[PDB]
Amino acid sequence: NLPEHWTDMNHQLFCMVQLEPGQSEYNTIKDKFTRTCSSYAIEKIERIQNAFLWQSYQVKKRQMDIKNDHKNNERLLFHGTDADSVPYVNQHGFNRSCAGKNAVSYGKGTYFAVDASYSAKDTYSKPDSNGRKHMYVVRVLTGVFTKGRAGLVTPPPKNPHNPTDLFDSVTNNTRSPKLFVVFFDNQAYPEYLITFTA
Amino acid sequence: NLPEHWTDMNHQLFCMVQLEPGQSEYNTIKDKFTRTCSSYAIEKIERIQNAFLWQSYQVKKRQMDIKNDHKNNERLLFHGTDADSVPYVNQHGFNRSCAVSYGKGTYFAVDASYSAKDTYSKPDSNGRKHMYVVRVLTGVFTKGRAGLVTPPPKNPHNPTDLFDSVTNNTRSPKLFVVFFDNQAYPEYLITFTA
Numbered sequence: 019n020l021p022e023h024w025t026d027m028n029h030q031l032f033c034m035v036q037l038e039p040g041q042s043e044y045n046t047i048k049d050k051f052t053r054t055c056s057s058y059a060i061e062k063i064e065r066i067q068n069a070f071l072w073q074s075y076q077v078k079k080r081q082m083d084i085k086n087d088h089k090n091n092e093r094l095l096f097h098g099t100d101a102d103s104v105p106y107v108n109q110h111g112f113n114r115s116c117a118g119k120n121a122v123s124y125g126k127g128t129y130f131a132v133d134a135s136y137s138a139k140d141t142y143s144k145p146d147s148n149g150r151k152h153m154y155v156v157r158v159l160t161g162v163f164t165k166g167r168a169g170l171v172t173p174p175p176k177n178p179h180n181p182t183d184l185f186d187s188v189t190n191n192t193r194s195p196k197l198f199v200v201f202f203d204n205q206a207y208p209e210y211l212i213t214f215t216a
Numbered sequence: 217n218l219p220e221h222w223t224d225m226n227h228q229l230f231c232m233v234q235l236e237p238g239q240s241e242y243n244t245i246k247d248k249f250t251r252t253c254s255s256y257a258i259e260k261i262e263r264i265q266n267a268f269l270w271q272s273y274q275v276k277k278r279q280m281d282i283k284n285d286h287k288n289n290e291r292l293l294f295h296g297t298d299a300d301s302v303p304y305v306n307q308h309g310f311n312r313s314c315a316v317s318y319g320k321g322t323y324f325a326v327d328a329s330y331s332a333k334d335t336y337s338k339p340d341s342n343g344r345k346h347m348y349v350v351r352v353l354t355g356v357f358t359k360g361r362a363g364l365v366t367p368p369p370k371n372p373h374n375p376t377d378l379f380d381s382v383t384n385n386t387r388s389p390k391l392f393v394v395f396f397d398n399q400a401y402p403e404y405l406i407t408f409t410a
């Protein structure tokens with residue numbers, strides 16, 4: 019079920035594809051980024067073609083579309099990280115067991131930002147030895163969500179008398195969400211890597 | 217593509233099906249257990265029919281069959297747990313975030329005797345103990361150590377091409393640890409007593 023606009027990979031399981039400015043695909047990501055980080059400049063945007071991460075993510079999405087019936091389960095969010103993590107995330111995606119304690123913690127999980135400006139902080143997108151900062155644009159299965167709490171290792175139950183029927187994610191604020199936390203593998207697909215500088 | 221031996225679910229996605237004592241599937245699973253736990257009394261064996269856990273596991277199985285270029289990635293192991301964790305496992309499988317001497321993942325035993333210790337299959341009020349029979353994608357494995365968050369790389373030259381699991385002993389393993397969701401399918405739950 020590999021998407022048809024992807025480059026042919028030739029029995030290869032993984033590829034980074036450099037986007038060209040002037041293409042809609044580049045321009046949409048640049049605009050989404052510059053909306054809140056117009057003081058930074060983009061070096062490049064690579065499309066992540068990871069067949070295994072894509073398949074496992076698309077199965078979880080189909081399962082959430084079935085379970086939630088007629089919700090928008092998928093959001094496009096940002097994740098800033100250090101240069102040393104980029105190879106791991108490219109191949110293996112987002113791993114809660116590697117995740118940093120956020121400065122405002124709404125659970126022990128992987129954090130995603132609504133605004134590029136949050137991910138562009140040096141604490142998340144740590145500038146490398148050449149001043150390159152790195153930020154992923156991520157399809158994230160936010161599903162049905164609630165306000166989190168620092169102690170969560172999984173999302174909380176919707177109903178305390180049914181402890182195993184869970185929210186899909188948590189947020190900082192249900193009325194104006196600016197971040198989301200997810201507690202399961204293959205709930206996030208890293209779609210694009212933005213490399214940028216001051 | 218839900219397996220032959222599963223029974224009809226009336227368009228449901230989860231159910232626990234109690235096995236008929238003395239029939240083939242029950243005898244197969246009983247024998248695996250009694251090989252090392254013949255002093256314990258089996259009260260029941262339930263088949264876990266979780267369509268979503270099964271789909272996610274099968275996808276990861278096919279990926280590891282392609283990755284490793286052979287089809288010997290799967291082992292049938294035991295997991296003992298407390299009664300308060302059984303409903304989560306039936307619905308969501310194994311979660312590393314819930315000793316951890318060989319790394320921070322989920323532990324599976326080769327022998328039911330290991331999982332039958334009270335420290336894993338904790339007796340509830342009436343002395344009932346709980347053990348899963350689990351399909352585990354052990355794949356290519358290496359010796360683990362404390363504080364692993366994923367398995368090590370096969371070559372430190374290529375740090376993202378990892379082992380699939382770790383063990384206590386590569387030559388004669390008695391336990392495996394997996395660090396990813398959907399590398400284990402809980403296939404049968406054994407309710408038993410000392």
Ligand SMILES: CC(C)c1ccc2c(c1)sc1nncn12
Pocket residue numbers: 294295296297315316317318323324325330331336391
């Ligand atoms: C001593 C330690 C490595 C260990 C920890 C947990 C565990 C086992 C062994 S065997 C088993 N079956 N279910 C759980 N566990």
